[PDB]
Amino acid sequence: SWIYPTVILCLFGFFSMMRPSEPFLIPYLSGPDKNLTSAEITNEIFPVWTYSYLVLLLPVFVLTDYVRYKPVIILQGISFIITWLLLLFGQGVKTMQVVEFFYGMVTAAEVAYYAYIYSVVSPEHYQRVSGYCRSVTLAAYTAGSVLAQLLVSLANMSYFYLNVISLASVSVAFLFSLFLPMPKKSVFVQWFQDLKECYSSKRLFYWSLWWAFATAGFNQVLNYVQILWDYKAPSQDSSIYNGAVEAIATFGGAVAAFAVGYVKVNWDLLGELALVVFSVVNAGSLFLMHYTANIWACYAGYLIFKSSYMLLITIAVFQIAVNLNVERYALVFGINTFIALVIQTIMTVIVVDQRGLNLPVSIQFLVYGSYFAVIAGIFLMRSMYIT
Ligand SMILES: Cc1ncc(CO)c(CO)c1O
């Protein structure tokens, strides 16, 4: 049945995403452990990750379906070992750039991790499995997050020890990915027309267009929500109050993902209504936590936004997988993620980069909320016109 591959992939996703070093990544390599200045951290180290993510997402959707989705997952586990091995025993800027390159590899293979379970289970389970997979990742995150907090609050555990235990956690993920069942088998412009034979399936462009636009704004909000929280309440002790909140926020999203799988409600009739309702919910939450002058209301707004977006993206992924009617599961997911990454990079260059408009953090979340409201109103007007 579907139980064994789903369980193995959920174990792999949990043990590969439960990394306690994530909330304390910058403090780890901005202190005595690595002795790296913050100037090189955000200008010559982090953008390498984005460039690697784009460059390595370019071939993932091309070649994942050919290799039947397993070697790319195994490649994620291999890159997980290399990334944290270099982050453990690597000094200087040069090692960090390779670390970000391998993390871009890791995410480009996370795309294949998402596509694999649809490549191996029958379509009837495509709903249930969907939620579970997403939920697991989210769950892993919050689990790891709280673990890190505990090891800062109840163990006095150094960041190096957090990193090595995270490497051990992703080491088990590699072993679980080794045991994943293998999916069964099955003039450049011609390939493009092949895409035209895949993106015309039961208006899958609509869900894909939402994915290509909503998740870019979601990633930007994730990147800059810590900055907004620091700006709103400039407290030196807010860090413990910040990351932990993200944890529970992620947990909320997990529940939302678990909302999709567990309940048995048709989504091919409620897909448009759910999309528009939770998109206007995302817009309202983004506007709520920008305007309110209290960090608790902003925390609630962020939790609502993250949970609603996670539910929406679970629905989007399930509906794309079901309506695809072609085996190219990682091509659609890969191209959607690549287009969304391009949009996110362009809009963060326009909005945040000095070469761009360079809006302040006060107006950054206003324009994020306006962008999400525009996205919601596009589907509001389309649904009303279609009726
Ligand atoms: C090594 C490494 N590089 C870049 C990022 C994204 O900020 C992450 C995610 O925290 C990461 O782990």
Q: Where are the domains of the chain?
A: 3-386
Residues 45, 103 contacting (CB under 8 angstroms)? no
Q: Which of 22, 43, 49, 226 to mutate to test the pocket of ligand 1 (most atoms within 8 A of CB)?
A: 49
What is the helix (H) or strand (E) element at residue 111, kind and residue range?
helix 92-120
| Two structure tokens written together for 374 | 């525009």
CA angle centred on 120, ends 117 and 126, rounded to 5°:
60
What is the helix (H) or strand (E) element at residue 361, kind and residue range?
helix 361-386
For residue 317, give every residue at least 6 positions away whose Cβ sits within 8 Å of its Cβ, in sequence order, or none: 114, 130, 134, 211, 333
Rounded distance from Cα 187 to ligand 1 centre (Å): 38
| Two structure tokens written together for 199 | 């993106």
- 53 in contact with ligand 1, CB cutoff 6 A: no
Residue 333's alpha-carbon distances to 32, 65, 114, 251, 317, in angstroms, are 40, 11, 8, 24, 8
In terms of DSSP H, where are the helices of 121-158?
Answer: 126-153
Helix (H, G, I), strand (E, B) or coil at 328: coil
For 4-27, the DSSP string reads HHHHHHHHHHHHHH--TTTTTHHH
Q: How many C-beta atoms lie closer than 10 Å to residue 150's C-beta?
A: 12
| Two structure tokens written together for 13 | 């996703």
Q: How many C-beta atoms lie closer than 10 Å to residue 44's C-beta?
A: 12
Residue 294's alpha-carbon distances to 77, 222, 301, 359, 366, in angstroms, are 42, 19, 11, 22, 16
The C-alpha atoms of residue 165 and residue 180 are separated, in whole angstroms, by 23
b/e burial code for range 48-77 (CB count within 10 A of at least 16 → b): bbeebbeebbeebbeebbeebbbbbbbbbb
Rounded distance from Cα 99 to ligand 1 centre (Å): 9
Rounded distance from Cα 12 to ligand 1 centre (Å): 19
Q: One-letter amino acid identity for 168?
A: A
Query: Breaks in the chain follow which residues, C to N over 2.5 Å?
Result: 186
φ/ψ of 44, rounded to 5, equals -125, 10
CATH code reported for the domain at 3-386:
1.20.1250.20
Residues 204, 324 contacting (CB under 8 angstroms)? yes
The C-alpha atoms of residue 107 and residue 295 are separated, in whole angstroms, by 31
Residue having the nearest C-alpha atom to atom 9 of ligand 1: 22
- 98 in contact with ligand 1, CB cutoff 6 A: no
Output helix, strand, coil percentages for the chain, rounded to the nearest 5. 80, 0, 20
For residue 339, give every residue at least 6 positions away whose Cβ sits within 8 Å of its Cβ, in sequence order, or none: 212
159 burial level (CB within 10 Å; 0-12, 13-18, 19+): buried
Q: Which of 25, 93, 223 to mutate to test the pocket of ligand 1 (most atoms within 8 A of CB)?
A: 25
